C-alpha cells in the first residue's frame, strides 16, 4: 500500500475541530481523528469508504 497510509494522522497547525478519517495500519482499519482545518496530509479522508479504498 502507499507510504502515506502508514504515517500517523496529522492534525496540523490550525485550531478547528474537524473529524476526518485516517488509515491506522497497526489496527488495519480506518478511524477518526481531529483535523485542525489546514495543511492536511494525504492520510486524511472525508469518509471511511474513500479511506479504505485508497489505503485498504
Amino acid at each position: 500500500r502507499p507510504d502515506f497510509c502508514l504515517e500517523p494522522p496529522y492534525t496540523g497547525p490550525c485550531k478547528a475541530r474537524i473529524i476526518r478519517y485516517f488509515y491506522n495500519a497497526k489496527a488495519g482499519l480506518c478511524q477518526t481523528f481531529v483535523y485542525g482545518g489546514c495543511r492536511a496530509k494525504r492520510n486524511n479522508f472525508k469518509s471511511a469508504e474513500d479511506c479504505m479504498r485508497t489505503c485498504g
Partner: protein, 223 residues
C-alpha cells in the same frame, strides 16, 4: 483552551459556537446580525449557537440561528493563513440580552503587553484529548512581534499577533479556532493557529483584527 478556567456562566456573552452537526469552531457576535470568525472555519452550511455555556445540554438561554451569508477575506491564504478572517451574516437578527451581547471592534491596535481574555470549547490538554462541556477562559497578554517571529521563523505576517506565554502551559487548542481574544472590551484577535498547544517557544498565533476594521464595516454595509 489548555491551562485555563471555566468561565463564569454567560460572562462572555459575545462568544458563539459554530455547529454543522457538532461544535467545530468559535466566533464572536459583533452586531445583532453578524458574527466574525476564522476563514479556515469555512463550511457551506453553518448553524450559529448563541447564549451557550454548556455546549452539550439545553439550558434555555440558547439561540440557534443559521448562517445566511458566509464571506471570507478575499486575500485569505490556506497555506500561510494570512488574512484568516471571515464574516457570517445570520438568517435573522438575534435577541440581544445579558447572555447574548455584541463585542466592540478595535479602536486601534493594542500594544504588546496588553492583558486579554481568550475563550472557547476547544481541547484542554496539550497531550491527549479532553473536550469540555463548559466554556473555558484564559487570561493572557499580547506578545511582542519580535518574540512571535523568533518562535515561528519566517511564518508571521503583519496580520498576525502572538498571544500567550513563551514558556507554554496555557494556550488555545483545536476547537477554539475563530474564537475571541478580547482586550479592554475590544476584539483584538481571532484564534487561528500554532504548533501544537501550550508548547514552550510556540505560543498561539492570532489574526490581528485591528487591520480589518474597515473591511469588516465595508462588507457589513454592503451585504
Amino acid at each position: 483552551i489548555v491551562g485555563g478556567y471555566t468561565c463564569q456562566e454567560n460572562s462572555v456573552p459575545y462568544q458563539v459556537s459554530l455547529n454543522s452537526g457538532y461544535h467545530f469552531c468559535g466566533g464572536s457576535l459583533i452586531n445583532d446580525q453578524w458574527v466574525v470568525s476564522a476563514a479556515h472555519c469555512y463550511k457551506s452550511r453553518i448553524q450559529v449557537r448563541l447564549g451557550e455555556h454548556n455546549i452539550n445540554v439545553l439550558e434555555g438561554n440558547e439561540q440557534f440561528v443559521n448562517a445566511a451569508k458566509i464571506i471570507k477575506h478575499p486575500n485569505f491564504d490556506r497555506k500561510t493563513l494570512n488574512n484568516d478572517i471571515m464574516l457570517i451574516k445570520l438568517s435573522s437578527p438575534v435577541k440581544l440580552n445579558a447572555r447574548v451581547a455584541t463585542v466592540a471592534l478595535p479602536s486601534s491596535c493594542a500594544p504588546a503587553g496588553t492583558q486579554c481574555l481568550i475563550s472557547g470549547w476547544g481541547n484542554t490538554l496539550s497531550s491527549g484529548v479532553n473536550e469540555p462541556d463548559l466554556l473555558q477562559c484564559l487570561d493572557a497578554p499580547l506578545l511582542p512581534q519580535a518574540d512571535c517571529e523568533a518562535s515561528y521563523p519566517g511564518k508571521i505576517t503583519d496580520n498576525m499577533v502572538c498571544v500567550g506565554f513563551l514558556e507554554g502551559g496555557k494556550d488555545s487548542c483545536q476547537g477554539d479556532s475563530g474564537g475571541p481574544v478580547v482586550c479592554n472590551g475590544e476584539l483584538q484577535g481571532i484564534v487561528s493557529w500554532g504548533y501544537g498547544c501550550a508548547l514552550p517557544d510556540n505560543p498561539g498565533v492570532y489574526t490581528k483584527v485591528c487591520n480589518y476594521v474597515d473591511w469588516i464595516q465595508d462588507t457589513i454595509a454592503a451585504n
